[PDB]
């Protein structure tokens, strides 16, 4: 009975990168993943995400998600997702099963120093030597 | 035999930080591996360094170790070390054992990103839901 909300009453959600959603139905995953953007996910990732629930459309409840991010970086689209407690078509959800997906894109600025992110300098060192 | 060279009289070194050096008497290493510096070796790192034996001044071999590095970095000290052959003394080495070890600093450039790049904003976004 606890483990059960209205999503649409939940008023805010803390997603951690390091840390997996609760599950039954299906696989924990983590709370907070990169899953593309045109940064990609192999670099910089922000490791906290903070959702507050902005109301209700008809269809979907309204999510509002902020970091913190380097000033390289923006997010893409961004999806919310939890796990219905009966089904997927289920209004209740499991408490603590929501998690984020985020596309990471580079901002303006970022894309400028993407731009200069290859250059590189020719640097000679004079070696000590060590006896072994 | 053929294992066994005058270090003085090796011409050059191709070091690569995803090979091991050749050993007998102890262990195998990386050929190419950051040691401290004041960048630390925690991020970027040179793959491959080219070295060329200029000469020996009676006590060492002089080597002259090179590499294109990012703009932000350069070498601290940098050490070759070989295996020598009988013993440490050996004035042969075995071939294939030499290794280099360097510190990486940050250049002047590297300075001033280093001071910049706590940069952050705070970015919002506006998600959408997905049911599971």
Same mark, same amino acid.
């Given at each position: 009975?606890?483990?059960?909300?209205?999503?649409?009453?939940?008023?805010?959600? *803390?997603?951690?990168?390091?840390? +997996?959603?609760?599950?039954?139905?299906?696989?924990? $995953?983590?709370?907070?993943?990169?899953?593309? &953007? *045109?940064?990609?996910?192999?670099? +910089?990732?922000?490791?906290? $995400?903070?959702?507050?629930?902005?109301?209700?459309?008809?269809?979907?409840?309204?999510?509002?998600?902020?970091?913190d991010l380097? $000033?390289?970086?923006?997010?893409?689209?961004?999806?919310?997702?939890?796990?219905? +407690?009966?089904?997927?078509?289920?209004? +209740?959800?499991?408490? &603590?099963?929501?998690?984020?997906?985020?596309?990471?894109?580079? *901002?303006?600025?970022?894309?400028?120093?993407?731009?200069?992110?290859?250059?590189?300098?020719?640097?000679?060192?004079?070696?000590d030597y060590?006896?072994?």
């Open positions: 009975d606890p483990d059960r909300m209205l999503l649409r009453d939940v008023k805010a959600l *803390t997603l951690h990168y390091d840390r +997996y959603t609760t599950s039954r139905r299906l696989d924990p $995953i983590p709370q907070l993943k990169c899953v593309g &953007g *045109t940064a990609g996910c192999d670099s +910089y990732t922000p490791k906290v $995400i903070q959702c507050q629930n902005k109301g209700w459309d008809g269809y979907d409840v309204q999510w509002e998600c902020k970091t380097d $000033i390289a970086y923006k997010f893409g689209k961004t999806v919310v997702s939890c796990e219905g +407690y009966e089904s997927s078509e289920d209004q +209740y959800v499991l408490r &603590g099963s929501c998690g984020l997906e985020y596309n990471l894109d580079y *901002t303006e600025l970022g894309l400028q120093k993407l731009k200069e992110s290859g250059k590189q300098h020719g640097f000679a060192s004079f070696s060590y006896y072994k």
